[PDB]
Design a binder for this molecule. Structure first.
Ligand SMILES: [Mg+2]
Ligand SMILES: [Mg+2]
Lengths: 76, 992
């Protein structure tokens, strides 16, 4: 399928994956396009946070779905 | 002409151009309820031209649950008149006025932006047609208990100069092609990060002069390192070098009318788990306005029949809509939940949407961010008790109390819990002030057995007044905590706030001891650094107390909640580190302005504070020489040489002696070291690959001659000689004419670049003047202060950074931008701060009620420049297991330190305790950073520790005896389980 990953900069990324892929393999593909280690990626989908060890079918991710690469901040 | 001292933190989120467009824009705020005062607060702090209030209703009781400016003795008066002097006090540059009823066409003509809050729809439709047809920015925001909506109509032609708020990215050119669609290749190890459709500009590209200084041209991303440009057929032949600069072009957007968007709605999702809700809530708010036409009042709290009336009305509105907006399925329960909390007015929801609605007003008269197009619906329906069956006849009924707007949603019992809450607020900054304000409106800590502890070490500065509304320009030089408590005690006299001035950390463990965290019910963070966040996180795990974490950065925000025995802690996850400049490309080979600003900040610390601190320790501590000789290589000689320079060599006595030093250090830093660098690397030396050395990230420097008439050369000497004299305590002048006349008589020593070490150190220890030789002399270090335009601090950095930028042909930056990088100022605005704090207190409603399901909590993430709103449930705490027992991050080993006899437990009894009671062969024991026991210990180290008690071992290795306040001890283990192999285990609470 074809999934989207949008960051906190409005940057939308296009990925070519399959429903049998895992969350760990998805984080590996983000590093090959953006350069962010998997330990620094915070992915959100349908109100849930993508954890390692799971698959794209566990969170029910169909075609043309959007993931959100968010961050935590320091100022206050 | 704009006050950079007040808007310092805000000019880094809007810019000078968009700020000037705010200075000439009048805003009208209609409806001064809880939502109306919040919107008007951030607008006045933002610095518009003038704000005008408007309201026809009286200050009822049900309005005090969120309006922080309606006192308990103002009930019955006009809301716009009483809150006018209070709002007019936030910004001394924005005149605030009120109005007493007429919303005529001639009154709206003198405004640019108009905000409609808590106004009937039929009355909003008339204003919407007029404003759109005459070019008046319209914002409509309504809040109904847990629900809320936001609408914008900036006309059908709005120019956007910035559609994302992110700074332009840059990249260095490797090769560009002479094809019809030219192909540009960036340098390796540096991704361009651009997007297809962006516009770039070229500079410093030699061989294609036509491509330089050109205007924006569209690009297509061909990969992580390449992209295409315009036509390159009839262009010159490329050579080498270049730099690509991203440029954002202004684009136009169109908004439909209010009456047209109400028929054809464009939604912006706030909760992606609630994707189909904005469509359903669009029908509920329309039925709520029509409900006021049938019964003349908002629906009663809870109740069955009034909820059934909205369901019957929503079905009629769904049928009378267009066949593309009509929903085939209606959510009956969602509209009935809307009827229950319809008559509610909650401070958090008002603070959240009020922060967003205020931000949309900033976008309207500035065109700086992408606005909401066009509807924004949000609901905090998870704050209600989990499946709990509570009746409205005793609780939700109004009691003519100030909490009627909040009890109508939750209840009197849930209000009595808040009065008995004890919370610890760590910080009184932007987030700290918003939390204290919401604390007063919510009612937490306002009872007999409640307390709010506010601690903060910082004093009120002028820059804090732009977002921390609890402070006034006459509260400068006062403690934030003490002043913020006095402001909250006026918004709610029932609250009980204690204000400390203690910096939370490992040094203040005595004040916030074990007994302090016991009676606490939760902690709310409001910090501006990551070290204090990690420290507060570890303590909330040790004491099992909930923590509400929040952070902002410009238009971005995040909210994370940590519930004991439920979710992971704040430290369980990791964040990317800050931009770390390699020492190589920082000291010798800079390429951007940040490399010289970071260099100029290090020049300030190492040239003024560092030598003075060493001289003072050399003249005070008798064991200073021995301490410096003990540490590292080529570091004793660096520090001992600096002491010799400051004591005898570079020691000034007169002001004229400081001017000569500033001129000598100038030639050494911007001429001598440049010639020394060019001597080791000629301007045309090849690398190992036969490529020019000065290419790409390495810019070829050039020596700089001292011209006394050049102000940049003079601005450096004036700031350097003064800061040099302040270090030794000498009177520094500011006459730039006499110094320049004196500079033409200074002699500069000749410099020729050049192409056992302990023997030089053995002479320095003998040539150093004894402290008894010169009694009385002392130097004074200079702490770096950014927000003071009179200490010559920023005057030095800008002159030091731009002078180095001229060496490496780097475009200089003004003192406003230099203050951002060198001062490491984090941009902040009042709208983002108020937005996240409103989300924080929403989860606070869940902590005081005790939610044990992860479905009820929501971690927030915001970016108001996109605009983005995302929520995700907190991750369950990781569950690990050793053999038959599995443990969580919130689990601990309880070991009673002292025994049946008065003596203390020994190390041998400790190891055998885990072998017999827990079946754990302990192989590594450590307390903090010191290690106590391990399998690879020397035989002698094991003998002198088995029979000694645990406290005697820790005090033996840590070189520090345990204090009298220590009541327990945390131990880390790396043991072997009954399975066979190594395994991780929980920590140990060793109670003395
Ligand atoms: Mg401060
Ligand atoms: Mg700060």
């Amino acid at each position: 399928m074809q999934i989207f990953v949008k960051t906190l900069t409005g940057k939308t990324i296009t990925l070519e994956v399959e429903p049998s892929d895992t969350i760990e393999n998805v984080k590996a593909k983000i590093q090959d396009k953006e350069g962010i280690p998997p330990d620094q990626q915070r992915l959100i989908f349908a109100g849930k946070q993508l954890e390692d060890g799971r698959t794209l079918s566990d969170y029910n991710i169909q075609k043309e779905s959007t993931l959100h690469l968010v961050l935590r901040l320091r100022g206050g | 002409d704009i006050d950079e001292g007040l808007y310092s933190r805000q000019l880094y989120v809007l810019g000078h151009e968009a700020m000037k467009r705010l200075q000439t824009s009048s805003v009208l705020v209609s409806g001064l309820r809880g939502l109306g005062v919040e919107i008007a607060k951030n607008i006045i702090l933002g610095g518009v031209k003038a704000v005008t209030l408007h309201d026809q209703g009286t200050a009822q009781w049900a309005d005090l649950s969120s309006q922080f400016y309606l006192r308990e003795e103002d009930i019955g008066k006009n809301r716009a008149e009483v809150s006018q002097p209070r709002l007019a006090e936030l910004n001394s540059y924005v005149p605030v006025t009120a109005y007493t009823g007429p919303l005529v066409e001639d009154f709206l003509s003198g405004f640019q932006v108009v905000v409609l809050t808590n106004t009937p729809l039929e009355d909003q439709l008339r204003v919407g047609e007029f404003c759109h047809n005459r070019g008046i920015k319209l914002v409509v925001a309504d809040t109904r208990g847990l629900f809320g909506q936001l609408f914008c109509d900036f006309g059908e032609e709005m120019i956007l100069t910035d559609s994302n708020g992110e700074q332009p990215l840059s990249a260095m050119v490797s090769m560009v092609t002479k094809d019809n669609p030219g192909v540009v290749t960036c340098l390796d190890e540096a991704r361009h990060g651009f997007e297809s459709g962006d516009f770039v500009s070229f500079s410093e590209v030699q061989g294609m002069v036509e491509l330089n200084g050109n205007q924006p041209m569209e690009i297509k991303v061909l990969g992580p390192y390449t992209f295409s440009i315009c036509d390159t057929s009839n262009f010159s032949d490329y050579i080498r070098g270049g730099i690509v600069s991203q440029v954002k072009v202004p684009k136009k957007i169109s908004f439909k009318s209010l009456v047209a968007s109400l028929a054809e709605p464009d939604f912006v999702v706030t909760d992606f788990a609630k994707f189909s809700r904005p469509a359903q809530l669009h029908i509920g708010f329309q039925a709520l306005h029509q409900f006021c036409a049938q019964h003349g009042r908002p629906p009663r709290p809870r109740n069955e029949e009034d909820a059934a009336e909205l369901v019957a009305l929503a079905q009629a509105v769904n049928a009378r809509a267009l066949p593309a907006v009509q929903q085939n399925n209606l959510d009956e329960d969602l509209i009935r939940k809307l009827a229950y909390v319809a008559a509610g007015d909650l401070a958090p929801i008002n603070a959240f949407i009020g922060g967003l609605a205020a931000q949309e007003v900033m976008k309207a008269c500035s065109g700086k961010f992408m606005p909401i197009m066009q509807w924004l619906y949000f609901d905090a329906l998870e704050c209600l008790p989990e499946d709990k069956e509570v009746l409205t006849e005793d609780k939700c009924l109004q009691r003519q109390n100030r909490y009627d707007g909040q009890v109508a949603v939750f209840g009197s019992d849930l209000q009595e819990k808040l009065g008995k809450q004890k919370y610890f607020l760590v910080g009184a900054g932007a987030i700290g002030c918003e939390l204290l304000k919401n604390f007063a409106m919510i009612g937490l800590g306002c009872g007999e057995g409640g307390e709010i502890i506010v601690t903060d070490m910082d004093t009120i500065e002028k820059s804090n007044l732009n977002r921390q509304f609890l402070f006034r320009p006459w509260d400068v030089t006062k403690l934030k905590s003490d002043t913020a408590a006095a402001a909250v005690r006026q918004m709610n006299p029932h609250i009980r706030v204690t204000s400390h001035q203690n910096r939370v950390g490992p040094d203040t463990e005595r004040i916030y001891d074990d007994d302090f965290f016991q009676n606490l019910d939760g902690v709310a963070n409001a910090l501006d650094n990551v070290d204090a966040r990690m420290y507060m996180d570890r303590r909330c795990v040790y004491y099992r107390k909930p923590l509400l974490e929040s952070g902002t950065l410009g238009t971005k925000g995040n909210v994370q909640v940590v519930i004991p025995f439920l979710t992971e802690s704040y430290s369980s996850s990791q964040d990317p580190p800050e931009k770390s400049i390699p020492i190589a490309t920082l000291k010798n080979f800079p390429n951007a302005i940040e490399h010289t600003l970071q260099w100029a900040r290090d020049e300030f610390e190492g040239l003024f504070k560092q030598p003075a601190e060493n001289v003072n320790q050399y003249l005070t501590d008798p064991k200073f020489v021995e301490r410096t000789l003990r540490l590292a290589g080529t570091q004793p000689l660096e520090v001992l040489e600096a002491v010799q320079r400051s004591l005898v060599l570079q020691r000034p006595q007169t002001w004229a002696d400081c001017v000569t030093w500033a001129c000598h250090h100038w030639h050494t830093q911007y001429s001598n070291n440049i010639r020394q660098l060019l001597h080791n690397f000629p301007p045309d030396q090849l690398t190992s690959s036969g490529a020019p050395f000065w290419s790409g990230p390495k810019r070829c420097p050039h020596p700089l001659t001292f011209d006394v008439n050049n102000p940049l050369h003079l601005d450096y000497v004036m700031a350097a000689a003064n800061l040099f004299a302040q270090t030794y305590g000498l009177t520094g002048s500011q006459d730039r004419a006499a110094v320049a006349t004196f500079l033409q008589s200074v002699q500069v020593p000749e410099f020729t670049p050049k192409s056992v070490d302990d023997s030089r150190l053995e002479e320095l220890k003998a040539t150093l003047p004894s402290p008894d030789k010169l009694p009385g002399f002392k130097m004074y270090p200079i702490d770096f202060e950014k927000d003071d335009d009179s200490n010559f601090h920023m005057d030095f950095i800008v002159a030091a950074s731009n002078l180095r930028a001229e060496n490496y042909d780097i475009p200089s930056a003004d003192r406003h931008k230099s203050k951002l990088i060198a001062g490491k100022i984090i941009p902040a605005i009042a709208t983002t701060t108020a937005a996240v704090v409103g989300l924080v207190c929403l989860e606070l409603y869940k902590v005081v009620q005790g939610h044990r399901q992860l479905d009820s909590y929501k971690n927030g993430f915001l970016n108001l420049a996109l605009p983005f709103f995302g929520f995700s449930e907190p991750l369950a705490a990781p569950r690990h297991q050793y053999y038959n027992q599995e443990w969580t991050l919130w689990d601990r080993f309880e070991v009673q330190g002292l025994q049946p006899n008065g003596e203390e437990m020994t190390l041998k009894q400790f190891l055998d305790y885990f072998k017999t009671e827990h079946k754990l062969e302990i192989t590594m024991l450590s307390q903090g950073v010191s290690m106590l026991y391990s399998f690879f210990m020397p035989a002698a180290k094991l003998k002198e520790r088995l029979d000694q008690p645990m406290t005697e071992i820790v005090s033996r290795v840590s070189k520090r005896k345990l204090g009298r306040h220590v009541r327990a001890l945390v131990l880390e283990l790396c043991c072997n389980d009954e399975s066979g192999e190594d395994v991780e285990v929980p920590y140990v609470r060793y109670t003395i």
